[PDB]
């Protein structure tokens, strides 16, 4: 049966000559889905193996002596530790970029981003830039709550205004998580009991700006819990985000399991959670609703990283398996709908992220609200269909089937009213909208609609409005791109100059002579002026011989004469 995830084994490190003993937190590092760096010791000689994930078949064994080696999340740049001596080294250029010797030993280090490596000593946290000649900069002092802890991770939000250090320690046959949440702006720290955490940018329903969320999981004093909270003051004109606290499930057999890693997918707005035993967890970032749970590994997955391409999580376990889990975009909505049986979440998910497979639900929600008498909300459902699913003529036909009530009218009127607020109305919607408006002496509303440019025009609307006010029809015809019907309007109303200017701009060529004859018929004086415009240099709109015999037909000999003499003076 279907599952909302896509689990994959990318490679087995044992198949690349990697020693099983070196497959561990202390000797193996993964800072991104791009490289895996292992520290091994061959025959009394210490070396560093870097595995390019684009070309994993052929690993490079370079002879490097370091107590720690971490690659750049993208660049072929490595950072190596030797005692208290740090060094950012260019792999491709075999040249040293930067260097620093620390007073107190660096107990943990990670790449915060491309060009930034964070350093953790027993007393403080530093940020060391790969660029320039800048020394490591102190960010904050380590909290007493984290004293004696084994530092397992360090994270920051996008804007890097919030920093987070995580450490764990063994207290009474339980691994206890200690975190320090430091705010750069407020310059203060908050100690938090948490095992795994992550930051996320999330824009709420009806919110102007993106909210910065802090999400952490723990198996602590109140058992397994997942918290989703907004950090700091919300931007001007925002809601804020209501704090979430949900349970994290640990089966009875897994009594010494706890959260080990967490990655949040901004794309689908879901939280990935990996526990010590190898269980994966899937949560909705918005509500903290659990979606999928499963054991994917028999061995602990000690290192994790975001799987950038698929917007998922990629880790490595003690067995040497390089595992990858991500959202299966084709199956997530059906699964939430039918296997999880959580329609409300499926609906929210399909509209939030533009995912597909929700159609039956939108129809159900519509038919239910239609039967409910609530036509106002029923319209909103049709309006916020993921890919214009309920924005069809059948919908309008349904709304047309309901009457005008005593003054509460009309559900079709209501449907259109909210619809234009979302975007531009389609050709058919515009047609059905104006029909009852034009029907009883009301045309001014069109002026606002057309000036605001909220509806899409084709020809069928123009001849419909032309039926009462042909001057307004010209505006419709103009936007509809139909030149034939635009020139026709200028011709009925005698505006000859605009006929020529328009046809020259849009490149449309009409039957100039036939237009001349029409002009000549109604009023010859205008005829002669029009004849003048038809012949001007390089590109003449009409044949000169053809226009003069038109003059002759009406026996306009004197004006024909005048026309030609004028034509000579304009050529001079």
């Amino acid at each position: 049966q279907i599952l909302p995830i896509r689990f994959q084994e990318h490679l087995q490190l044992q198949n690349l000559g990697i020693n099983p003993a070196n497959i561990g937190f202390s000797t193996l590092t993964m800072e991104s889905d791009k490289f895996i760096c292992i520290r091994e010791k061959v025959g009394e000689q210490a070396q560093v193996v870097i595995i390019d994930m684009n070309d994993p078949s052929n690993p490079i064994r370079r002879p490097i002596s370091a107590d720690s080696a971490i690659m750049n999340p993208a660049s072929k740049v490595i950072a190596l530790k030797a005692g208290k001596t740090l060094q950012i080294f260019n792999i491709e250029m075999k040249s040293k970029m930067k260097a620093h010797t620390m007073t107190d030993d660096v107990t943990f280090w990670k790449w915060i981003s491309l060009n930034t490596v964070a350093l953790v000593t027993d007393n403080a946290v530093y940020h060391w830039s790969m660029e320039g000649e800048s020394q490591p900069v102190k960010m904050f002092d380590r909290h007493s709550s984290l004293a004696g802890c084994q530092i397992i991770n360090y994270r920051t939000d996008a804007k890097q205004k919030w920093l987070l250090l995580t450490g764990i320690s063994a207290q009474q046959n339980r691994v206890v998580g200690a975190m320090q949440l430091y705010s750069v702006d407020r310059k203060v720290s908050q100690p938090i009991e948490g095992h795994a955490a992550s930051f996320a940018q999330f824009k709420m329903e009806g919110n102007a700006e993106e909210s910065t969320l802090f999400c952490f999981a723990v198996r602590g004093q109140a058992g397994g819990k997942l918290h989703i909270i907004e950090v700091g003051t919300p931007p001007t004109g925002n809601q804020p985000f209501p704090k979430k606290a949900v349970d994290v499930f640990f089966p009875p057999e897994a009594q010494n399991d706890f959260p080990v890693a967490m990655q949040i997918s901004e794309k689908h707005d879901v939280v990935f959670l990996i526990t010590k035993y190898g269980y994966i967890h899937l949560y909705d970032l918005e509500t903290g609703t659990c979606i999928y749970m499963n054991r994917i590994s028999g061995e602990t997955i000690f290192v994790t990283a975001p799987h950038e391409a698929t917007a998922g999580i990629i880790g490595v376990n003690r067995k040497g398996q390089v595992l990858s889990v991500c959202v299966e975009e084709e199956n997530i909505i059906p699964y939430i709908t039918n296997v999880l049986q959580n329609p409300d979440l499926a609906l929210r998910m399909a509209v939030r992220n533009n995912l597909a497979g929700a159609e039956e639900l939108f129809a159900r929600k519509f038919n239910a609200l239609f039967a409910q008498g609530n036509y106002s909300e029923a319209a909103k459902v049709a309006a916020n269909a993921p890919k214009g699913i309920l924005r069809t003529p059948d919908t309008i036909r349904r709304f047309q089937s309901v009457p005008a009530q005593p003054g509460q009218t009309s559900p079709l009127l209501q449907y259109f009213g909210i619809l234009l607020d979302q975007g531009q109305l389609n050709k058919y919607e515009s047609l059905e909208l104006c029909r009852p408006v034009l029907q009883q002496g009301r045309k001014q509303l069109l002026e606002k609609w057309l000036k605001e440019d909220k509806l899409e025009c084709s020809e069928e609307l123009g001849d419909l409005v032309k039926s009462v006010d042909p001057t307004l029809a010209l505006s419709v015809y103009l936007r509809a791109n139909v030149p034939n019907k635009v020139i026709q309007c200028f011709a009925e109303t005698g505006q000859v100059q605009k006929i020529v200017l328009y046809a020259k701009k849009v490149g449309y060529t009409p039957d100039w002579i036939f237009l001349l004859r029409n002009v000549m018929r109604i009023s010859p004086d205008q005829g002669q002026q029009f004849a003048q415009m038809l012949v001007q240099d390089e590109e003449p709109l009409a044949d000169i011989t053809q226009i003069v015999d038109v003059f002759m037909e009406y026996n306009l000999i004197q004006q024909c004469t005048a026309f030609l003499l004028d034509a000579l003076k304009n050529n001079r």
Partner: peptide, 18 residues
């Protein structure tokens, strides 16, 4: 991208507007 810009100039010259 560039089409809408030349379009607005056109409506200004011929369509009745006001």
């Amino acid at each position: 991208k560039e089409s809408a810009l030349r379009k607005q100039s056109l409506y200004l010259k011929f369509d009745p507007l006001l």
